[PDB]
Amino acid sequence: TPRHRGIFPVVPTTFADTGDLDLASQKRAVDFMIDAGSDGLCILANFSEQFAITDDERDVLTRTILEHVAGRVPVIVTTSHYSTQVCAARSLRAQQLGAAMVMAMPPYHGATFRVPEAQIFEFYARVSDAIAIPIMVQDAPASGTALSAPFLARMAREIEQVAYFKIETPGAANKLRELIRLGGDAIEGPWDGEEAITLLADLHAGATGAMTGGGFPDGIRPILEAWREGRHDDAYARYQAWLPLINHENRQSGILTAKALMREGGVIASERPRHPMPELHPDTRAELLAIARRLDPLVLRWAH
Amino acid sequence: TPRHRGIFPVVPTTFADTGDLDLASQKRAVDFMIDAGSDGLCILANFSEQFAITDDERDVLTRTILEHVAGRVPVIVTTSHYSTQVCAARSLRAQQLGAAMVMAMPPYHGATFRVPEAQIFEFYARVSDAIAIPIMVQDAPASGTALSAPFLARMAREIEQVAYFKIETPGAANKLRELIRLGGDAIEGPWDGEEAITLLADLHAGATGAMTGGGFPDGIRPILEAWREGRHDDAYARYQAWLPLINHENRQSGILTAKALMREGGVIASERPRHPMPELHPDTRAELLAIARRLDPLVLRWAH
C-alpha cells in the first residue's frame, strides 16, 4: 500500500582529515549502504552533520549523492530550514534532481525561536504546494517544538504531500499508535528513528519504517522483515543480538558511529567530524569496534 | 580605554511584502539608525532574522550594509556557525569587507547539539587566529550552552581577539560583575542585550555597552550617556520614561518591534517577517505604537 517501507539509514557526510568534503569516500559510503540492503537512503540529516556545512556544500552533496545512487534506491533529501520559501526551494530542487521524498523538521531556531501550530501548518502546506513528491515530517527533540499526534494527523489528512513521519520523541511507540489511529490511511509512513533503539516496541505500535544510523543497516533490516513476516519471536531474537550495538550508538558513540565503522572497514578515508564536534573518546571507539566484531557486520567485510 | 562603547543596535533585515530582500529599505533603515545616534551597528544577528536567510543573502546583506554605512560608524558582523572553519572563513570575509568586529554564538545546533568547553575554546581560538579584528562572544539562551563567567574571562585572557561580550542570560548584572572581576582589563567590552530591559542594573554592574533593538536607539543612548557622566539619578529618570517601550518590545512585540516602528514612520516599505514567522497581533502592534507616540522617537519623525 505505502510507496515506501523498510530501512532508510542516514548517510553520513564524509570529510577529509582537514575538514574538506571528501566526495570519493562519500560515494563509497553510499555504495556500501546500498550493498548493505538499505531500502532507501536519507541524506543531509542531523546524523549527516548537516549543521556543519554551508549551503553550497549542501547542494554539491545533494547533486553528487543523487547522481551516484543512479535511481537504484529511493533517496530522502532533508530540506529543513526555518524559512518556508527556502525549504520549498530546496525541496523543489531535490525533486528535480530525482529525490523520492524530502524530510523537514518543523520551522524553529536554536532553543528560543518557535512557531505557532497555525504557521507550522502553513509551512508544510506551502512546501507541499511547491512539490509533487511526499514530505516526511520529523518529530524530534532537536526542534524543541511539540508536534502532537492530533496535529500531525491533521496535516496528513489536510496537506497533500504530508504522508510520512519520523517519530523520534520520548514514547515513540505510544505516539505512533496514536498517530495511526487518528490519521488512518492518511498515515502512509509511520516511521521511527533514534538509530533503532526502540525498534521492537515501535513495530508493535505499527511502525513500517526505520531511519537508522548507516553503519549497519544489514543488521537492523532483518528485524523489520521478520516482523513483516509475522514472526515476532524471530524479530526479538534478531533485535536482541544487535541491541548492544544499537545501544552503544545511541548512548555512547552517537553520530560518529557509522563513520568510525566505515573507516575501520576501509569504506571511507577519514572518520573525523568537522571541528568543533569532538572526536570519539578512545575507549568509546574501541568498545564500539569490539561489539561490532561480535556481530560480523558487512561494513567490516566490504571488499570494494 | 575600550575601542568601542555605547549603543550598538541590531539592524533588522528588511523584506519586500513577498519575502524577497528589500535592499532599498535596508539602506534607509541603516541611515535612520545612524541618524538616531547609534555608536555602532550589529548586523545579521537573531533580531535581524538571520535564521530566515541563505548564505548568499547573508553575503549580499553584509556587502550592501557595510558599503552603505561607508565607514560612518563601526559595524559588528554576526558570523555565528557551528563549523569552526566556516565561522573563521565568514569572519575573515567580514573583516575584508570592512567589519570592525565580529559577533559569534558559541557552536551549537538546535536544542540537542552541544560542544564541550574544551572545543568551544578551540573554536574561538581558531576564529581569532584567522582574523585581526575583535571578537564578541555572545552568551545567550538561544544557544542553550553554558558559558560561565570564569570560562568567558579565561578566553579573554588567553585568546587574542576575544575582547567583547554580550551577556543576555538571566541575571546578566551579576554575571557581568563576575566577568569583569575575573577578566580584568582583558574584558574590553562587557555589554548587555535583550533590548535593554535590564540596562540600569547592568550599568551598575559595570556594563559599558548595549546591543538593543534598532527601533529607538535615540531613546536608549541617553541612559548610557547619563551613567557615563556619573548622573545615576538622571539615568534612572530617562530609564523610567522609556522602560514601558523597552518592556513592550521585550515581552510583547519582540523581533518585529523595530520594523513595525520603521514601517509606521515610512522608513521602510514593509514590516513583514519571512514566513513562517507570525505577524504581530493587531492589539500588540497598536499598543506598541501608542506607547511610542508618548515618547516622540526619531523613527516616527524621520523626514527622509
UniProtKB/Swiss-Prot annotation, chains A, B:
Major enzyme class: lyase
Active site: 166 (schiff-base intermediate with substrate)
Reaction(s) catalysed by this chain's protein: 2-dehydro-3-deoxy-L-arabinonate = 2,5-dioxopentanoate + H2O
Annotated Gene3D superfamilies: Aldolase class I
Keywords associated with the record: Arabinose catabolism, Carbohydrate metabolism, Lyase
SUPFAM superfamilies assigned to the protein according to its UniProt record, in alphabetical order: Aldolase (SSF51569)
GO biological process, one term: L-arabinose catabolic process to 2-oxoglutarate
SMART domains hit by this protein: DHDPS
GO MF term set: 2-dehydro-3-deoxy-L-arabinonate dehydratase activity; 4-hydroxy-tetrahydrodipicolinate synthase activity; protein homodimerization activity
Subunit structure: Homodimer.
Function statement: Catalyzes the dehydration of L-2-keto-3-deoxyarabonate (L-KDA) to alpha-ketoglutaric semialdehyde (alphaKGSA). Is involved in a degradation pathway of L-arabinose that allows A.brasilense to grow on L-arabinose as a sole carbon source.
Protein name: L-2-keto-3-deoxyarabonate dehydratase
